[PDB]
Amino acid sequence: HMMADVETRLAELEKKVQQLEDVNAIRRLQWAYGYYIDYNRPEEVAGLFAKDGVVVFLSGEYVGYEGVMRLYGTWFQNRFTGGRRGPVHGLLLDHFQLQDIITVAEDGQTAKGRFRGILAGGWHDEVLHEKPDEVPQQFWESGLYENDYVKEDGVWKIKRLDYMMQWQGDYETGWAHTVAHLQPALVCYPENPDGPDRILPQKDVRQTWPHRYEVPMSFAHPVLGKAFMVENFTPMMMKKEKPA
Amino acid sequence: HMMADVETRLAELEKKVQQLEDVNAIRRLQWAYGYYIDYNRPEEVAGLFAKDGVVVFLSGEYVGYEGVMRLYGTWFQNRFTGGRRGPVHGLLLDHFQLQDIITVAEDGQTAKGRFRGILAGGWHDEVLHEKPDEVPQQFWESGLYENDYVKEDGVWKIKRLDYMMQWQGDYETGWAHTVAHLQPALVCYPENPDGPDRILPQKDVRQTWPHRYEVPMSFAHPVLGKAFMVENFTPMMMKKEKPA
Amino acid sequence: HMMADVETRLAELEKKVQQLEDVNAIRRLQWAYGYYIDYNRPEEVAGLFAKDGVVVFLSGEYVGYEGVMRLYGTWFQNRFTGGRRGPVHGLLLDHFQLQDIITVAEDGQTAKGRFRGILAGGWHDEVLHEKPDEVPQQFWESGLYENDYVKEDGVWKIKRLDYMMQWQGDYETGWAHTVAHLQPALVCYPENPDGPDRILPQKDVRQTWPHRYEVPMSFAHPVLGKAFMVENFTPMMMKKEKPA
Ligand SMILES: COc1cc([C@@H](O)[C@@H](CO)c2ccc(O)c(OC)c2)ccc1O
Ligand SMILES: COc1cc([C@@H](O)[C@@H](CO)c2ccc(O)c(OC)c2)ccc1O
Ligand SMILES: COc1cc([C@@H](O)[C@@H](CO)c2ccc(O)c(OC)c2)ccc1O
C-alpha cells in the first residue's frame, strides 16, 4: 500500500545515489592516476589496477601488476628520472587530466570512461645531461583515453587503461613542425625489456602524429542516443570547392 | 505522523538527487560537445541543441539545426578539413574543456553553466597546403562559455551556446605578439554564406584580442551570495602609484 | 520493524546525498576562485575565505580578509592591472583549473582538496609599458593546491588555500630554459608591503623551479588505501644503469 510505494522510492534513490557515487569514484581513479604518473611513482599506478588489468600504450598490451610496473617503471621511470620516485630536480612531467565522460553499466559492476591529458614534459638545462638521446628536451603532448573499470569487493579498479597519444610538439617548434618521437610497438617483452606482453592485432595498431585515427566515443549521443544519424544533418551544410 | 515525515524526507532526497543528476547531465553535454568539435563532426553538435537552440560566435547568432550546421559545418569543417568528418591526417583542433560551474533553476527545467576551453590548433607541415590564407599554421586559443540549457521530454539540451573567444596566440610568437585573426560578425547569412542569422545588438558586440570585456558570472558568489559587495573589501588593499 | 529499516535507509541516503553535494560545493569554490583571480578581482576572492582563513603563497601565510586582499590586491592586482578590477585591455591571466580530488571529513564539517592550475599569463605589446621590470612579458606557469575547507553556518568556505607553484616557462624559451622569477618569501608585512603575516617554518619552505619538492597527496590510495605499500611493487621493475 503506502509501504510498497516507500520501498520502491527508497530502492530507486539507492540505485541513483549508487551511480552518482560510482561516477565520482571512477573519476577519482583517473585523477589519482594522473598525480602518480606526474611524480614517476609506478607502484601507486600498478595498485590502481585489477590483478588481470591491462594498460595499452603505443598499440601494446602490458598485463597485470608486472606489466604496469614494466611500462611505468622499467621504461618510463628510467627514461625520465633514472629510476627514482619523483618529483626530482629540473624534471617536468605534468599530465593535465580533464574532460571525463563516464558511463556506468546498468548492473553497477563495470564502467567505461573517456578522458584526455595534455602533457608538459621536459628536462631543465640543469639536468639536460640526464635526458636520453631520442627525446626532445621539452615538449607538449596530448592523448585520449578510453578506459574500462571493474568493481571488485566494493572497490572501483582500472580493468583497461588505453592511452592513445594523438600529438606531440617540441616546445621550440610546436605540433605543426614535429613528428611523434614514439612509434607503435614492434617487439614484445621479454626480447624488448620495455616491450608489451602482446601487440594489438594489426587492424587496431595506430601510426602516430602526424597520422590521425578516430578513437570511437564510449558514450551514446547524449541528446538523441542510438537514434542519432549523421545523414539526418549533413544535408544542412554546404561542402565548399576548397577550405576558406 | 511517522509517514508524513517519511514522505517529506523521500521528496527532499528525490529533489536533491534529481539536481545532482542534472549537473552531471549538463556537464556531459559540454564535454561531449568538445569531443565532437575536436573531430569536425558538426552533425553530432547540431543534435545536442533544442530545435529553437542558438549558438553565438563572434557576436553572431546561428539559429536551430540549420544555423548550427552552417557554423560548425559550412564554415568550420570546410576551413579545417575541407568538408570531411574528422579526425584527418595532420589536422589538430583539440579544444580542452574545463572549469564547469553549473546553476540549475529551482524548477529543474532550465540551467546555466559557465565553462572554458583552451584550443591547440593547426596544420602539420604535411597538410599545410590545405590551410586557408587568413589562418595561422598553428595557434593557441582560449574562450569562455556562458550557456543556457533546457530540459525537454526528460532530456537536457543546449538552448544557447555562447562562445566568447578571449585570446589567440600564434604558436611561434604567443598571445603577447598576436592580434586575433577573427573579428566580430559584420554580414549575416545568406549574403555571407558563413554568417549568422542575426548580429547581437551593438551594446553586446565584442571586439577581439587584444580587446577584453568582462563575461559576467552566471553564478552568485558561492559564500556570501547576493550579499557580496565589492566595496566591503576594496578598502583593505593599497592601490600603488605604478605596477610593481 | 519495517519502520526501523525505512529510518536506517533514509538516514544512510541523507548522509550520502549530503557528501555528494559537499563535493560539488567544494569544487565550485575552487572553480569560482579561478574565474575571480583571472579577472584580478581580489574582493570576490577574499569573500570565499572563512574570517580566520589563510592563503599560502611562496611559503608565506596571509591571514584573513586583510591578508587575502594584500596578496590578491596590494601585490597581484597592482602588478598585473595597476590596481584595476579586470579584465583589462591586453592583459591575460588565465589560470586553467582542473583535476580536483576532494576528501570530505566523516563528520561533514571539514574537507581537503587537491587541485591544479596551468596559467597562461602576459601583457600584449599594446600594454607592455605597464609591465613591471622583474616579470616576463608572457609565460606559462603551473601549480598544485592542497587546500582545507570548513563548513560554517551551512556554507562551504576556504579555510586554507595553499598554492605551491611548480614551474614557470617564458613563452619564448619554455620551462626547460626558464628559472622561476618568484622565490620563497623573505620579508613579512608590514616591512614588506606585499609580504605575508608569517613565513612557514624552514622545514616547510620551498625553493622554486628548477627545484622540485613533493606535495604529499591529501587522498589515500583509492584502491588499496592505507594498505598500499611501495615495497610490494618496486621489485617488479628493473632500475637501469642509465636513462633510455
Ligand atoms: C600510458 O600512460 C601514459 C603515457 C604517456 C606517454 O606518451 C608519455 C608518458 O609521459 C611519454 C611521452 C614521451 C616519451 O618519450 C615517453 O617515453 C616512453 C613517454 C602519457 C600519458 C599517459 O597516461
Ligand atoms: C562556437 O564554438 C567554438 C568555436 C571556436 C572557434 O573560435 C575556433 C573553432 O575551432 C576557431 C579558431 C580559429 C579560427 O580561424 C576559426 O575559424 C572560423 C575558428 C572554439 C571553440 C568553440 O566551442
Ligand atoms: C595564490 O594564488 C595563486 C597565485 C599564482 C601566482 O604564482 C601567479 C598569480 O597569477 C603569479 C605569477 C607570476 C608572477 O610574477 C606573480 O607575481 C606576484 C604571480 C597563481 C595561481 C594562484 O592560485
Side-chain angles (χ1 to χ4, degrees):
Chain A
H1 187 262
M2 272 227 63
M3 291 306 276
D5 193 59
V6 164
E7 162 66 40
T8 310
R9 294 170 66 179
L10 287 176
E12 190 68 10
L13 281 165
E14 290 165 335
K15 185 174 84 195
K16 290 172 165 172
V17 162
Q18 182 71 58
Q19 196 186 78
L20 286 173
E21 289 179 332
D22 290 347
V23 167
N24 283 354
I26 290 152
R27 191 199 294 108
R28 199 188 182 84
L29 283 175
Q30 180 75 19
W31 287 183
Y33 169 74
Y35 287 123
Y36 297 139
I37 60 164
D38 288 1
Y39 280 2
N40 289 287
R41 294 178 185 195
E43 299 86 354
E44 285 82 341
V45 175
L48 299 171
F49 285 72
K51 288 179 184 210
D52 63 347
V54 172
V55 50
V56 194
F57 181 65
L58 297 173
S59 302
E61 293 168 318
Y62 302 69
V63 175
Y65 291 157
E66 297 190 332
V68 174
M69 284 296 306
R70 182 170 72 249
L71 182 54
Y72 292 90
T74 301
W75 195 7
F76 293 173
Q77 193 195 66
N78 284 301
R79 174 163 276 199
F80 288 115
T81 68
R84 291 169 288 165
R85 294 174 43 86
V88 293
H89 194 77
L91 188 283
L92 171 59
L93 209 65
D94 279 351
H95 316 79
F96 301 99
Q97 298 284 309
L98 63 144
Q99 209 168 336
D100 51 296
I101 298 178
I102 290 157
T103 305
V104 186
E106 210 47 44
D107 74 359
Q109 302 315 302
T110 67
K112 287 179 180 296
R114 191 184 188 92
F115 314 83
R116 74 199 307 170
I118 173 153
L119 169 59
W123 293 256
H124 189 269
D125 287 334
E126 292 182 6
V127 300
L128 176 56
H129 54 95
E130 299 184 7
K131 181 190 77 63
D133 278 338
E134 297 60 31
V135 189
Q137 178 166 14
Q138 47 172 357
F139 63 95
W140 301 104
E141 169 174 324
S142 203
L144 294 166
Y145 301 87
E146 275 288 10
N147 299 344
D148 290 283
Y149 301 85
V150 66
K151 196 189 202 187
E152 273 172 4
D153 302 305
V155 178
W156 288 101
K157 303 176 189 180
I158 308 179
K159 180 56 170 267
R160 203 168 165 96
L161 188 132
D162 187 353
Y163 179 70
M164 284 160 286
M165 183 265 286
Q166 297 298 301
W167 58 265
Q168 301 173 315
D170 292 1
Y171 188 84
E172 292 74 17
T173 60
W175 42 92
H177 308 305
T178 297
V179 168
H181 63 267
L182 302 163
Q183 294 302 315
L186 283 180
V187 187
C188 299
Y189 179 80
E191 184 187 338
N192 171 8
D194 302 322
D197 297 298
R198 318 169 275 265
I199 298 187
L200 292 176
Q202 285 179 317
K203 62 185 170 60
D204 299 324
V205 164
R206 295 163 178 278
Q207 301 315 298
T208 51
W209 179 242
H211 299 275
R212 297 221 65 187
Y213 297 89
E214 67 168 350
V215 175
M217 311 304 169
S218 61
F219 55 94
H221 188 278
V223 173
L224 298 170
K226 309 141 176 295
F228 173 70
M229 287 213 159
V230 169
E231 41 272 18
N232 286 335
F233 297 90
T234 310
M236 299 179 206
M237 61 166 290
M238 164 158 93
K239 313 265 176 213
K240 292 174 189 177
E241 51 155 10
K242 56 210 39 170
Chain B
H1 187 262
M2 272 227 63
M3 291 306 276
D5 193 59
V6 164
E7 162 66 40
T8 310
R9 294 170 66 179
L10 287 176
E12 190 68 10
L13 281 165
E14 290 165 335
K15 185 174 84 195
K16 290 172 165 172
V17 162
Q18 182 71 58
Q19 196 186 78
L20 286 173
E21 289 179 332
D22 290 347
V23 167
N24 283 354
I26 291 152
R27 191 199 294 108
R28 199 188 182 84
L29 283 175
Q30 180 75 19
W31 287 183
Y33 169 74
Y35 287 123
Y36 297 139
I37 60 164
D38 288 1
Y39 280 2
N40 289 287
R41 294 178 185 195
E43 299 86 354
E44 285 82 341
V45 175
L48 299 171
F49 285 72
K51 288 179 184 210
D52 63 347
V54 172
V55 50
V56 194
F57 181 65
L58 297 173
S59 302
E61 293 168 318
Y62 302 69
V63 175
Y65 291 157
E66 297 190 332
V68 174
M69 284 296 306
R70 182 170 72 249
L71 182 54
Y72 292 90
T74 301
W75 195 7
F76 293 173
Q77 193 195 66
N78 284 301
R79 174 163 276 199
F80 288 115
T81 68
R84 291 169 288 165
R85 294 174 43 86
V88 293
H89 194 77
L91 188 283
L92 171 59
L93 209 65
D94 279 351
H95 316 79
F96 301 99
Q97 298 284 309
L98 63 144
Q99 209 168 336
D100 51 296
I101 298 178
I102 290 157
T103 305
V104 186
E106 210 47 44
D107 74 359
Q109 302 315 302
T110 67
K112 287 179 180 296
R114 191 184 188 92
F115 314 83
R116 74 199 307 170
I118 173 153
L119 169 59
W123 293 256
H124 189 269
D125 287 334
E126 292 183 6
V127 300
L128 176 56
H129 54 95
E130 299 184 7
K131 181 190 77 63
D133 278 338
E134 297 60 31
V135 189
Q137 178 166 14
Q138 47 172 357
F139 63 95
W140 301 104
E141 169 174 324
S142 203
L144 294 166
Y145 301 87
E146 275 288 10
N147 299 344
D148 290 283
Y149 301 85
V150 66
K151 196 189 202 187
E152 273 172 4
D153 302 305
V155 178
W156 288 101
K157 303 176 189 180
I158 308 179
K159 180 56 170 267
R160 203 168 165 96
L161 188 132
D162 187 353
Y163 179 70
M164 284 160 286
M165 183 265 286
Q166 297 298 301
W167 58 265
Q168 301 173 315
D170 292 1
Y171 188 84
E172 292 74 17
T173 60
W175 42 92
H177 308 305
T178 297
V179 168
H181 63 267
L182 302 163
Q183 294 302 315
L186 283 180
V187 187
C188 299
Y189 179 80
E191 184 187 338
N192 171 8
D194 302 322
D197 297 298
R198 318 169 275 265
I199 298 187
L200 292 176
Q202 285 179 317
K203 62 185 170 60
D204 299 324
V205 164
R206 295 163 178 278
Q207 301 315 298
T208 51
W209 179 242
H211 299 275
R212 297 221 65 187
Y213 297 89
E214 67 168 350
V215 175
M217 311 304 169
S218 61
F219 55 94
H221 188 278
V223 173
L224 298 170
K226 309 141 176 295
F228 173 70
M229 287 213 159
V230 169
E231 41 272 18
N232 286 335
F233 297 90
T234 310
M236 299 179 206
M237 61 166 290
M238 164 158 93
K239 313 265 176 213
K240 292 174 189 177
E241 51 155 10
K242 56 210 39 170
Chain C
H1 187 262
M2 272 227 63
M3 291 306 276
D5 193 59
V6 164
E7 162 66 40
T8 310
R9 294 170 66 179
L10 287 176
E12 190 68 10
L13 281 165
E14 290 165 335
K15 185 174 84 195
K16 290 172 165 172
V17 162
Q18 182 71 58
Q19 196 186 78
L20 286 173
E21 289 179 332
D22 290 347
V23 167
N24 283 354
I26 290 152
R27 191 199 294 108
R28 199 188 182 84
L29 283 175
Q30 180 75 19
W31 287 183
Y33 169 74
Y35 287 123
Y36 297 139
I37 60 164
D38 288 1
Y39 280 2
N40 289 287
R41 294 178 185 195
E43 299 86 354
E44 285 82 341
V45 175
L48 299 171
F49 285 72
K51 288 179 184 210
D52 63 347
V54 172
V55 50
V56 194
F57 181 65
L58 297 173
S59 302
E61 293 168 318
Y62 302 69
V63 175
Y65 291 157
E66 297 190 332
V68 174
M69 284 296 306
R70 182 170 72 249
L71 182 54
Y72 292 90
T74 301
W75 195 7
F76 293 173
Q77 193 195 66
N78 284 301
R79 174 163 276 199
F80 288 115
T81 68
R84 291 169 288 165
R85 294 174 43 87
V88 293
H89 194 77
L91 188 283
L92 171 59
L93 209 65
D94 279 351
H95 316 79
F96 301 99
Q97 298 284 309
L98 63 144
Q99 209 168 336
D100 51 296
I101 298 178
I102 290 157
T103 305
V104 186
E106 210 47 44
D107 74 359
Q109 302 315 302
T110 67
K112 287 179 180 296
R114 191 184 188 92
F115 314 83
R116 74 199 307 170
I118 173 153
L119 169 59
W123 293 256
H124 189 269
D125 287 334
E126 292 182 6
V127 300
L128 176 56
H129 54 95
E130 299 184 7
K131 181 190 77 63
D133 278 338
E134 297 60 31
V135 189
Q137 178 166 14
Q138 47 172 357
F139 63 95
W140 301 104
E141 169 174 324
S142 203
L144 294 166
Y145 301 87
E146 275 288 10
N147 299 344
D148 290 283
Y149 301 85
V150 66
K151 196 189 202 187
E152 273 172 4
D153 302 305
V155 178
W156 288 101
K157 303 176 189 180
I158 308 179
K159 180 56 170 267
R160 203 168 165 96
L161 188 132
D162 187 353
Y163 179 70
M164 284 160 286
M165 183 265 286
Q166 297 298 301
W167 58 265
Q168 301 173 315
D170 292 1
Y171 188 84
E172 292 74 17
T173 60
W175 42 92
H177 308 305
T178 297
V179 168
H181 63 267
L182 302 163
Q183 294 302 315
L186 283 180
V187 187
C188 299
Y189 179 80
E191 184 187 338
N192 171 8
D194 302 322
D197 297 298
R198 318 169 275 265
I199 298 187
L200 292 176
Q202 285 179 317
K203 62 185 170 60
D204 299 324
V205 164
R206 295 163 178 278
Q207 301 315 298
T208 51
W209 179 242
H211 299 275
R212 297 221 65 187
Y213 297 89
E214 67 168 350
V215 175
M217 311 304 169
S218 61
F219 55 94
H221 188 278
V223 173
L224 298 170
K226 309 141 176 295
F228 173 70
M229 287 213 159
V230 169
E231 41 272 18
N232 286 335
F233 297 90
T234 310
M236 299 179 206
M237 61 166 290
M238 164 158 93
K239 313 265 176 213
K240 292 174 189 177
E241 51 155 10
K242 56 210 39 170

